């Protein structure tokens, strides 16, 4: 998954 | 601390040099030294701190996943016994990762969060607290795993509550917080429906607020909205 | 040494795990521990040692070049004075780089080279000695710069002399040694004509020997021959 | 330049  | 004799401004200058040189361990040590001067951090300085530790812990997480996968294959039926070395080395990387998370959480607790009064700083630091408890949760397997998970949840929830009250739905900190909390739901809390609902609602409410923004704020906001959509595409 | 209590075989196993996880600092510490057990290294083990330190020093060299370029721009006419921080941080990275080179050169001197009797090991270690003196030369600016350069030259020359006598012209160690010695001529010794002549002669003599090789040896040899050609294209 |  994409996180920042 | 080894940075106690260096000027705060010099530490910030060198953190920026270290970023240019992709020396993120150095960058993190410099920013830790700057935090330990005791003064609050500006917006730029907060983002230097987060960039530095995100890169350090990101490398550790990637390495831990490689080693964990090797370890799991070694414990399948038919795999030859190879001794304790895989477990030992995975534990070594895991302990270093936990140490970095504890360092960051220590800086937030002493005393970044308690002095942060503006929404932009308080939400930023609470998101960081949620993030680094999330990374601890990724490797947790013991009797405190539930408490680590709830510590991440609690930090994210407080950050969400403030961000809803004090920031517009397009604020990049609010958006990145919602992004990461949705991933917490999907990957940590076994709550994929909550993850999907949060991502969708966050995206839709940001979309409806884009008309208020300048071109440059529009670019900042839509970049994070695309990550919400990328996750939704993976999850649905 | 911190690895003194770990089995040699365990150190080698963990070096391989660290490579898979791209943890090259760990990989280097494990291989240093293996060397310090005192036994000679097999072909595979020599290449684990070189891979580990090549990646560590490669990152340091890249960072040093970024910082050196910033420092040089700061000393141009019209650039604003920014204080000692750029020089200080470049010096910090430079000193760490020199420490890694000294560590590798120390392992070769105590006692890898003196026990290496076969051509494949002796040429490998002498190439390494030339390489790490070359990296010291890249950052040298003082009264010992000429002696550092001659130390690199001397190691490369001995390795070349043995490789010509004992290895076929397609041997990948011989080819990589000639590749790197040619770069030494071009980048360190201010001898671009010697660099070009060595690269061309090495390539042509390898070409004429390819017919003796199996498919798999052909692949190994032509890969390094392509790097000789890539340099010649840059240089001519 | 390229080295190995
Ligand atoms: Ca001061
Ligand atoms: Ca033993
Ligand atoms: Mg200090
Ligand atoms: Mg553990
Ligand atoms: Mg459903
Ligand atoms: Mg030990
Ligand atoms: Mg120096
Ligand atoms: Mg000429």
Author numbering:
A (entry chain P), D (entry chain P): 389 to 392
B (entry chain A), C (entry chain A): -4 to 231
What do the study's own words say?
The 14-3-3σ protein, which has multiple interacting partners with specific peptidic motifs, was used as a case study. We have observed this phenomenon first-hand with human 14-3-3σ, a protein which has several hundred known interacting partners in the cell. Furthermore, different isoforms of the 14-3-3 protein are function-specific. For example, the 14-3-3σ isoform (but not other isoforms) specifically targets p53 and is associated with tumour suppression, making it invaluable to determine crystal structures of the target peptide with the correct isoform.
To address this problem, we present a combined co-crystallization and peptide-soaking approach to obtain crystals for any 14-3-3σ–peptide complex that may exhibit difficulties when crystallizing under our optimized ‘sigma’ conditions. The second step involves, after these 14-3-3σ–cJun-pS227 crystals are fully grown, displacement of the c-Jun peptide via addition of the desired peptide for the final structure at high concentration to the crystal drop and incubation for a period of time until full occupancy of the peptide is achieved. We have found useful criteria to be using the peptide at >95% purity and performing the soaking at 277 K with an incubation time of one week. To demonstrate the experimental reliability of the method, we considered this approach for peptides found in the PDB where co-crystal structures were published with isoforms of 14-3-3 other than the sigma isoform, since they were not able to crystallize under the standard ‘sigma’ conditions or any of the other hundreds of screening conditions tested. Not only does this significantly reduce the production time, but new 14-3-3–peptide structures that were previously not accessible with the 14-3-3σ isoform, despite screening hundreds of other different conditions, were now also able to be resolved. The new strategy that we present here has allowed the determination of several new structures of 14-3-3σ which had not previously been possible, illustrating the ease and success of the method. All models were determined to belong to the orthorhombic space group C2221 using Zanuda. In addition, the method retains the robust, stable, high-resolution and well diffracting features of crystals originally grown in the sigma screen.
